[PDB]
Symmetry: D2
Subunit: 276 residues, 4 copies
């Protein structure tokens, strides 16, 4: 718990509505304002989904460029990580295309799983073509794993030379209905499983909904990094809607200050994530 802590803010996502979370940033300007407040509260990475002005999820490259430019202009030092997951059911071609904008980092979903009432599909041949696109556009991946078997699947892609990023950054996404939950036994199992299978990988955790607090506090004291935000959780407390993404980031920064864990500077975040 003395190693620097990287906080990611997943500020928008594909499914959160403005009716449930009135402070949900939808436009590039709203997303830039939120990103500045999150950076000042301690966030070093923004996990970015884009929306049309009507709130529907978007995959348009011009809209992604608009949001990336707006965020970059308010906080040049923040790391802008784009989502290649998008909205469940979106075509894989549309999910892959924004890598052509050459972001510093982007997500790489490592498997298929039932996801609420639907299926989040990542066909093995599509995972390989996405992994190949990361190499061609020189984008560093954040590999998203929702279950134990996805760690093994990623290890096999490393062994075959399909994923060559080293060190590799994994994010455990815990709490999806259909995926592994965020209970402490599970996060401890996952970090130890990852250490066995991909020994040099670094990791972060996203705890959906009620799992935000248990995943965050374990990650605090096990060297992991943490994601928070409206994409994953709109509540500050049970039954109490959050005021902003920055409010969620600031609580994690306050707990890190209480326990003496320093927040990573932008330079340290880029060094840990091998973005230089």
């Amino acid at each position: 718990h003395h190693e620097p802590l990287i906080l990611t803010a997943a500020i928008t996502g594909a499914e959160t509505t403005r009716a449930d979370q009135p402070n949900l940033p939808i436009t590039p300007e709203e997303q830039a304002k939120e990103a500045k407040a999150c950076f000042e509260a301690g966030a070093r990475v923004i996990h970015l989904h884009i929306r049309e002005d009507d709130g529907r999820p978007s995959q348009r490259l011009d809209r992604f460029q608009e949001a990336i430019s707006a965020i970059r202009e308010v906080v040049p030092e923040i790391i802008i990580q784009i989502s290649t997951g998008g909205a469940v059911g979106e075509s894989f071609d549309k999910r892959l295309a924004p890598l052509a904008l050459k972001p510093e980092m982007a997500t790489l979903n490592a498997g298929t799983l039932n996801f609420g009432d639907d299926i989040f599909i990542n066909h093995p041949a599509d995972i390989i073509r996405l992994a190949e696109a990361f190499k061609q556009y020189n984008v560093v991946p954040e590999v998203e794993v929702y279950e134990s078997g996805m760690v093994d699947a990623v290890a096999r892609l490393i062994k075959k030379g399909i994923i060559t990023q080293n060190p590799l950054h994994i994010q455990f996404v815990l709490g999806v209905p259909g995926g592994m939950s965020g209970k402490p036994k599970n996060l401890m199992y996952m970090m130890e499983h990852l250490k066995e299978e991909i020994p040099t990988a670094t990791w972060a955790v996203a705890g959906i909904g009620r799992w935000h607090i248990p995943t965050s506090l374990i990650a605090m004291v096990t060297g992991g990094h943490i994601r928070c935000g409206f994409e994953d959780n709109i509540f500050y407390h049970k039954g109490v809607i959050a005021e902003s993404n920055a409010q969620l980031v600031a609580r994690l920064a306050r707990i890190a200050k209480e326990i003496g864990r320093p927040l990573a500077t932008p330079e340290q975040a880029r060094e840990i994530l091998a973005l230089n």
Copy 2:
């Protein structure tokens, strides 16, 4: 390791070929002969997939009835458990239909996962309609779980009253490329996770390929039950093709005898699995 041991023989499966495993039983008569040898070697359950005479996987109800009748006639006491998984890619309607034959037991796959180069699809709405069909035809399920999150998903179906079977029998299917592996850390994690989430559930393990021996020896001494067979593993030793499914069953029976774990009688197997 003093509790009775139930051995399941998965004798055929959907993908194993006769060229790789010349002793693969394909016809109902061949499957009955294998089932008798497996029963005499210690198996109390047969996990049944059917094939056409040309070796292609089948879902025909008349072919399922032919195989069930042939096995029943050689060993009336064996438990015949039919597969509702079938061949990856088969239509869900064809996978569900054989429950109408009212077998004593059948498999119920609890989630979707990448499975080798393809996806084994179990849409959440199809899992619910299959669970409903088990109730209507008074069939006891064996719930197949390939990942941690599938245990939580099954617990939510129990909470909603969609799965009412109690005690419920779970089988951990470990070693699929895309699913959780069969390493000892994983089987220990899964039995403890299941005890937390579905405390009265019983369990078995199927260790695909190289995971057959590690899963079997852990299950031996943790009270679990074991599945073996050509569907999951065609080798008796690394690089040494097995002579029969009964050879694989007999090794497990010999190890159980060495350590003093009794094999379940047919009556004990039916009592543990709540088939009476």
Copy 3:
């Protein structure tokens, strides 16, 4: 994590020196002042060792009565838990005798271990006669466990009817040089091992030195209770001396408030610990 949190303050101990920790309470008056400040900061239990005015550890019943009375006079709501461990090397007769003062609670050390440069001795026959004295004097024990095997040893005393207290309160004491450390894998293992062996037991954790923060944050989100204080840790941060025991308690209360875990009232602490 809405379950009430009981904070224990171990304010003095037997070995801490005022040379290392200038604000260590030594006398009954100093201990009463600290106990009131700890109670106001959120502590519901004081774990009490006594000292002579010169700072030497004491086992005298008149001195224990002086300290108990001084604390009760200024903060009657707090639970005063006396130590039967005392200073390593103390005679077992002197360690047992203060149970005759009929405190609400007292510690019951469940095994022997190397403890720094010495041995903390708890002979099996002495553990049994101490367990019998808890029954004789109607005192509730807090059972101190430093290793996995002490949980099994306590389970055997329960089976034999030597310990009949139900529910039983266990405290994991982690970080002793010679005992189990406070790394997160260990505290997760211990709570799970205790759930298997003594399913109805409640638990707390004391994290010695550098293990204070990792044990506290894991206990926060797993339903455990927490001990802090100069007996276990004199530092607020690595290389930063704590200002008082109440400063350590207040940090835990602030983290609990951040995450929405309520602090137990005195009535709830007595109900959970079965002190009524």
Copy 4:
């Protein structure tokens, strides 16, 4: 699980009686006969305690030399590992002295624990002087661990350069009343904890009494080595006395042959244990 398996036979011990186990070897001639039968059954190490002709435990160097010479004369290939634990209650000077006989290997008990009705004492200063005697006499240690905290204590002696043996061989001694039990969760925890704290250490497990089978089957498939014998367990099955130590060794050799795990040759056992 193709890694060679080293079997140790702990043939006599200090406490086993011929009244409970009529075929217990007591004299040097009896111990030599048993050692040859154990070697032929697959054992590569003899863990040696000596007795007087009346069955009383001994620490005499002339009696140790008699037993070592008798075993070497009939089976020179076996590794003779002497006990420095001896009978609980024995003086530390008498326990250390036989290292002057310059055996190939000897045990090094890494902590104190309650042991049945007594205490097995290993004062921290005595552990250090024993570690120094291993260097003085050029003997390789087998470090005996009964609890998690003993692994940390050994790691601290390595850090201080008190133990310089590399690779270090640890034996987990599980099932002592007072020590960690041999349940599968515990052996999995211990091998993983040892991998975190002493990454290059090799390990074996001794499962006392009823824990012999669960520890052996887990070690079989996790790369560990196994100890068996009358010192730890006199029963072949629950309520079935073992016929000899070689009968216990032969069962482990049969299970290893069933699963395809080779037994170490004497040369491989000396290479793995760094005895050349």
